[PDB]
Amino acid sequence: NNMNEVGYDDIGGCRKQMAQIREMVELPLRHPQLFKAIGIKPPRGVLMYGPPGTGKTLMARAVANETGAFFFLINGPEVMSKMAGESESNLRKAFEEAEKNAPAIIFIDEIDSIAPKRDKTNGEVERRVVSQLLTLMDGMKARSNVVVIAATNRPNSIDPALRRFGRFDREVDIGIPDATGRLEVLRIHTKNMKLADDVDLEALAAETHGYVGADIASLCSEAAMQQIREKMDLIDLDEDEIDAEVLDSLGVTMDNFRFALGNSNPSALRETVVESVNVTWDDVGGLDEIKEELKETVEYPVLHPDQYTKFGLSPSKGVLFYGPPGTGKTLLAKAVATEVSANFISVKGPELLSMWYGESESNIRDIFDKARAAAPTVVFLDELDSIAKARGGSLGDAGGASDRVVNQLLTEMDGMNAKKNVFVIGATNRPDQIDPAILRPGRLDQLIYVPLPDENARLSILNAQLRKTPLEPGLELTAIAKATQGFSGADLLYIVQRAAKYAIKDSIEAHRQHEAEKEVDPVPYITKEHFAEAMKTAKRSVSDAELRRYEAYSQQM
Amino acid sequence: NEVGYDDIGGCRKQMAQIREMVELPLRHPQLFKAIGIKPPRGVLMYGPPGTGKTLMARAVANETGAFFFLINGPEVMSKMAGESESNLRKAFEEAEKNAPAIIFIDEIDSIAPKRDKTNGEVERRVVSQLLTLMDGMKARSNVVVIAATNRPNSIDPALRRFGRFDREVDIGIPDATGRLEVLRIHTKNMKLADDVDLEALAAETHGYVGADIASLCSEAAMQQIREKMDLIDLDEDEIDAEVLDSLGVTMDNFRFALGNSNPSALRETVVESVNVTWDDVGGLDEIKEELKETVEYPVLHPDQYTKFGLSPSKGVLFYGPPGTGKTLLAKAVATEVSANFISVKGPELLSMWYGESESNIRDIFDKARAAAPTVVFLDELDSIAKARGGSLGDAGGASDRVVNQLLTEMDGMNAKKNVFVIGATNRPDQIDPAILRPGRLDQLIYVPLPDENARLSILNAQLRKTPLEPGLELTAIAKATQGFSGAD
Amino acid sequence: NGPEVMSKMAGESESNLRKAFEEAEKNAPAIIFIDEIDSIAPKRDKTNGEVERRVVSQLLTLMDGMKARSNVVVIAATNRPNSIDPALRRFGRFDREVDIGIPDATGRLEVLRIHTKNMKLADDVDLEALAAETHGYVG
Amino acid sequence: LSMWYGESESNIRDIFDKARAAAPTVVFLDELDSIAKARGGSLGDAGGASDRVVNQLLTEMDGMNAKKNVFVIGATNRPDQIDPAILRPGRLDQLIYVDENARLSILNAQLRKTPLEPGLELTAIAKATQGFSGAD
């Protein structure tokens, strides 16, 4: 049954692409009379490209199974050999077998091993193999009736001679599926295995965002493994034997898929995986209207696409936060990264720059390609005062790389649209040093100013760090807020940390006294005396000159 | 002899994950037919060197009774044209043909250099052959592949896909309990003195990982050998039984070995251990106590912080007139405080190339947070922390990018477990306002001129190792100097 | 020797290293001296070539792995220790790094006595003054 | 404005070469204020780059004869800070001072592919907004 695989019912989420491939491969191979009647000669080569795991090899198995026509598998790196001049003979005999036996189908996987573009290559055997393949493919008459199936992971590293008319005329961009396609594929893979009743695959498809083809299969497998793991502990399932009664009592529930989702990530973003930071929207005290506006602006393209279509306003993808230090811009970014239900790639500003020539722009292009692959995504740019510096900030030149990287960022952000769904969040401390080219409309439209907290916002912030902290019943925080005027969230954090340190010192002193003399903890809660001792040394961070500069900038906008 | 699952302690979670993947589909396959789907078959172990990944591979090879193949990374390649791919095919064919088997690919970084930045055709052909073998037409039939790496980011993304390498296990630095299991594993097959106390020793180790612990044990043993082979003669021929027996390893041996050995990761930036003590610093008693408590509280009492559920303060910046004793405090912290010390000068990290300053800063902070808890000393912080935009003529804002890298890297979307930054500057006006922000450098300590009793304390500290006249008194000297500093 | 292993053919340097180590283990309990290791260890991360990475990986595997080292001791010499891959400066590969630094007055006198032994000195020659006035000589 | 020295002026040189190659053409210089600046006006600059940019622009515009019939179009918000060396006769002498009907046409062209309410007139927005612009 495994060798049988599955025909059209295996591959899902790409109706148009599969229909096109079947049209090209079956009709001119079963009955070529209709193509002669209409008067078009069907092509002899078809290219497939796209990200890995989209289903190309699956496409090859489906065409091999659905059509009973003879097949002959060859692969790129297994054609050449050690003896002098046998790759050409190998390809020649391959084509001879393809012609002599029947109107067969030939499938070459990973052409990149054979087409190095003829520009980044120095040896001669590759030239021989490329020219041999070119002449063998070109020298195919109408009566040959043999088709080749090509499978490349990256299409731009192809010898352009193969893109010429008459060679591999039909390309097919097998892209990422949509919500319906992803749900369909989930159904396809999970139908053999048992599934518990309490399951809503619609939610799983609305939450599955960057996964493509195989990653969802990984999700399913991981959930199943989790189910197997939880049932082994509780029943004391011993490795020595298996109880049949346990076997029939096996069902993967929705919680398994939730756990798998919490542990799995899209394959494309696997390299750029970030450490997990647990921030919630109630943890970010204050900034209520700003938080509501950001979440609403990010939620509309992902929840009401019909509403987005039924309109004409261009969705402004970018946004830039600016304000004084320690107000919570990075905290808002953390909260978005944790609790938005979408992809997120965090980058620090200067990391991308490299000493070598070209690598920097290569990094910008590959990162934005990863952003495009795992659509939707949220690319968080830290400290644009390192990338988007004013071309004239410094008279001295650092090699001209700064202009090149800035131009690379503009060309890769101006080459966007509604598709691929990528919202770029900016966050800078000094708004004067960013290039105005970036703040042009259509590139970075929204400009949110994160001001110093007010009395209610400050009280909310103070309550936000004391959520998990055990606290003495007799404490009132309104006085603390009223007494602080120019403080920031960082100052409040410093106050709370000082209070915690004083409490810990008292606890350790009391424990040492107890051990010397010999409730367990004399200080289970923080005290007003501790708060008084912390605010005896507390003080504000941002100066009045900085406040003046930010107010002047705000009024200028 | 054989290294089983009881010699690979300290990675219980990952050990269980890999034991499950290797055993459950090879002990009770019926369960995987009952659930309906096939099990995972590709797993990638990654982590810093010496954490025990190769040890884990050895344990799996020793325990499982199935067929096992071992492949060193570069060994597969050969001189004859198209011989590497033939070797890969032969290896996979042998693995499949004989029985269900475990392949082990050691040092995968040598084989998959992303197939995009490389320019050799042989590399691209070996990568394509591996990709085809591990996933493709007739890819695998009940054989699992494990690979080991130190730099998972240097691997081609196509290899990091489900079906080829589905799960990546993170073999990271062990915790204190992990160090305890490692010590018990390595100190169970030796003769030790009764005085030995392994728990305190594991507690006092702060960044040592695996082979580091083994090195510590070896050093202790070697010192014991160099403690009892001195009383006995050279004995070129043979050793008497009375010394061969009753050797014993005292705890002092372990303390001595701890005073020399250092984490393998931080061996790059080891600093010579200058000898200072708390009594060497005259005056500044309250600053001494505040610094001592602010450093030792997170590292000795973590339960109380989790009881209150709040993170500690990290940064501190000394500022004051030159020579008040800031570098002396830094030296004392470096020499006696238990946390690791990375002493770096101000302008040391700058470089003429483009971006190498920020790369070096990132490397330094990565090492600092790797062997946490760690203390980082930034001497003359005003050299690296300049007021952004103050200089019209600059090397394309090299200082601006450096300060931005420092700010974002020391506080961003990181883990921020235990890194304590110490700053020492005598001109605090040149510092950027963001650096002074709480949560980056929360404690701004001013070191004023010494008072009369503090000048007396300094004089006593500086005369602590010199013979003096019995009739000499230092109170007059203190009464006479009023504007002096420690240097004077 | 350090650069002695490199060859033009693809896949021959690491083969030479393998042959060296296998011969060393096949012959007797041996000692392996690698001089000027800075040419076979450029940290494998800042370098951009390909053969250097392969030799570094081969050396790392040979140093430690499966059936790592049966009665063989490895000695290395370098002029700058910071420019070597951290994976080599670990226990099991290079357990201990000895710092052979500048000798002192007594060391300088010892070196002078060692070298002047084969030469014919006069009866008026003293070596203490020479070792005193000699300050920064590396031997 | 290229960071590399010399390249900055070479950009304007090959821009005017591309202009003179495809004759006739229109070179719309947006935001003239920057390029049209007094030579060495700012004491602090990147080695007086402004002066070299203005000199390249002046010496690559004054060399235009009756042949090649190029035409430079400028636009600015602040006309105070433009260089009188670029407002000279023989290079660029015209001064067009620059409505309600254009605002109504802009509002009607922006609302083409938009489901507007039928009971709505845009003449009120045209009459209320006087000194506005198309971006706002």
Partner: peptide, 22 residues
């Protein structure tokens, strides 16, 4: 029989210079 060969020649780097104003 044929044979292969490895080759890694060099690359190109970028330097940073400092200027003085007056």
């Amino acid at each position: 029989a044929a044979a292969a060969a490895a080759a890694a020649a060099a690359a190109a780097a970028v330097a940073v210079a400092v200027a003085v104003a007056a």
